[PDB]
Amino acid sequence: ASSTNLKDILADLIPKEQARIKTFRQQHGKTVVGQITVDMMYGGMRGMKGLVYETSVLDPDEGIRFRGFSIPECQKLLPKAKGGEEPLPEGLFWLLVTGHIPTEEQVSWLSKEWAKRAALPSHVVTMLDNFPTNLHPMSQLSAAVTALNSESNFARAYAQGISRTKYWELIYEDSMDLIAKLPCVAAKIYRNLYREGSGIGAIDSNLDWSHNFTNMLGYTDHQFTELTRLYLTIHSDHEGGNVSAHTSHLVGSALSDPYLSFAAAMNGLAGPLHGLANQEVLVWLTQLQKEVGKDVSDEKLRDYIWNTLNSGRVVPGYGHGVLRKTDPRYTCQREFALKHLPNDPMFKLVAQLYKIVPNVLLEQGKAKNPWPNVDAHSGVLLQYYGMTEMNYYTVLFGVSRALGVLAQLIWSRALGFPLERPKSMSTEGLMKFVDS
Amino acid sequence: ASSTNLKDILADLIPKEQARIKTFRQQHGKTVVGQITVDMMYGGMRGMKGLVYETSVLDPDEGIRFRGFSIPECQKLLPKAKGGEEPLPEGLFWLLVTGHIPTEEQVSWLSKEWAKRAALPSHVVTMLDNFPTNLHPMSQLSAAVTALNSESNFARAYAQGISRTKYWELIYEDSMDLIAKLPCVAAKIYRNLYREGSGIGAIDSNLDWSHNFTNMLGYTDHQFTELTRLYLTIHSDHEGGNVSAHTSHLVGSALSDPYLSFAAAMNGLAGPLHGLANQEVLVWLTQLQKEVGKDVSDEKLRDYIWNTLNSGRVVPGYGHGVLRKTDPRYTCQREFALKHLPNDPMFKLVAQLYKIVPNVLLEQGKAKNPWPNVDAHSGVLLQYYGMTEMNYYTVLFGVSRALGVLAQLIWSRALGFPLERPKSMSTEGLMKFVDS
């Protein structure tokens, strides 16, 4: 048994999970888990248990769990870079794929794998280099990833009629390839838009994925590489129901390769209801700081907040959520900032707001959850390190999110998930149906 | 009242449908329409009523209906080109959008609209021209459409904080623009791949959409233009549950613009379980014809089919479907072929199979629907007219399918449909849930 080759490890895990699901469906396949109402159909399947997605699960008490592990558990258990304290995305992906915390050796192996597979074909480089500056970074990302499907081993093998039993293998290879390439596509977009088309340089075969990424972005600050490791780890997955995960799932169910599936997912992520909360918080912070200065007292800030909520406006990043308490993905970033930039004026405001907003929201009685989420904290940190181009923040989210959705995609094909095909009805149709 | 401006007509229809749904949801929003089982979750939401999609509805006895009209009814009622017998796609789109059969004047107006809006921006032209020959036509299509989102009026307006009440308007404008541009994108792909990069030439402002399309493809046979009109009409829509419709719906629900939504949908359409059936039938027909020769007897062909099924293989185009009889989209194409290429040897085989395969499948008693679908007939017709490049066939399907999904998209935003967000569960999670 190979102790580092993820593919071999995954081959040994698959049959056992297949057997387990086969037995589960024999015994409980007919078990009802919910009802479908008219309202659910009009309201985007809200509250409808609709799909199986294995890699992550929202714990109402603890926040998002990656294969049963909470964020704080991942923070402790996942390997780090040498001389680093943030969990490496590699180890997260290993976790999502195998269900097991990787060893150091396993993480180091994965790093080398993604470094080896990182080449872009010249047609994708040419295409990126020709895009104009008014083409949104997310559109460049999706178009380039679609154009990378020329490299798909799965598309080619399916056309030669390979056995169903081998689908996950080729899906695994393509997903590994795509993950390897993403930092190169993303950095090329960053440089072409915001560094006058300068080169991304080379991949170093001895660096982790995050560090090749920050190098290609043109950053040379060890704590920005640490932020990037954390960022990429914690945004990696958040169940199957969000649009980006669901889009990848749905497209992937037609046996579209991972490049096609992931690019479609990015078009969903680009949606202003899925993809912009981080930017929105940062815009609002920046306006607030311009209005009241960089050194407002707790008392004046409490009045400002009181007045903003009383005039029907929200505080971005606060007030929505299933969670009873602060999103651990917020806490992570607060810890980071307390260690590395405690004197930063914008961070101090973000920290002031953390003390004040929740108690004001409780008092006003309007919001069910007064605590902030991950997007409340991310922007201030990216800006601190020089990453000020807010349009680009969603590309970072997408590079992260590739980890979760592609880890699931492998499993979807390993377990033989069929085509996603719900039944639609018209309003006219539904009206007739209910009269019966 | 404007008698030709679709936008004004649509503005008068919307409030009445809003009112009707508001009332329907007050009275029956809580009405249960179905149950969710464990099996449905593992099986891609099969048999789960999951969404409202207005533009078309599958009649279990008669096939697909476009706003209540069957395909043969649409064949009679929809306007034709001058000196033509086939229904214009323009009139189909008008039908899906308004629920009304358009007049001649309305169709003529729509043709001019799509001719006026047909320009490609230079960056999309450059990108297409630089794609290499090994990049699949569907990938080129999706990438170009994503790159066209720089032209989205909706994306821009949403970022300036437009009222929800106005979403459909800009969605309407972008959808009209995209539909106008698609033949240009598709023909550029065709010419760059298969006509040595020659130009697509001009849009004639007095031609219908289909005829500008066939002109830009480089075709001159009037009956190929007639095929194209029929083809584009009948593939336009098929409820919301198929992957391309559903992907557009899902992405569109995040308020991604129609370019992003449509491009994601094409990545779903590119999937071998949604979009390769046409090519697969044609490959199998060609092999069969080589093996048994032209003018094979009924008897020899029946034996061939029995032997294929008895050796565990299926006959492509036959045997799957929820429909209990021949797909009307198949019948349409058979009628076309009987009129225009009755003595074509491949067509004769397709017709022989129609006589024999279903009877054999009935006799065998296994496959629950023995009749063929649309993809059983399309390839022989395209090949007859010189469109032999099978990789390209799915682009035609996608240009057609734009009509349905974008007609619905306008309505989805008009009616205020929210983000599509089902709940996912893991296997471990589902097991715990059922024990409770």
Ligand SMILES: O=C([O-])CC(=O)C(=O)O
């Ligand atoms: O995608 C995610 O991280 C889940 C999501 O949209 C949210 O709950 O805000």
Ligand SMILES: O=C([O-])CC(=O)C(=O)O
């Ligand atoms: O969307 C389509 O028309 C192809 C398809 O899957 C169906 O006909 O059910």
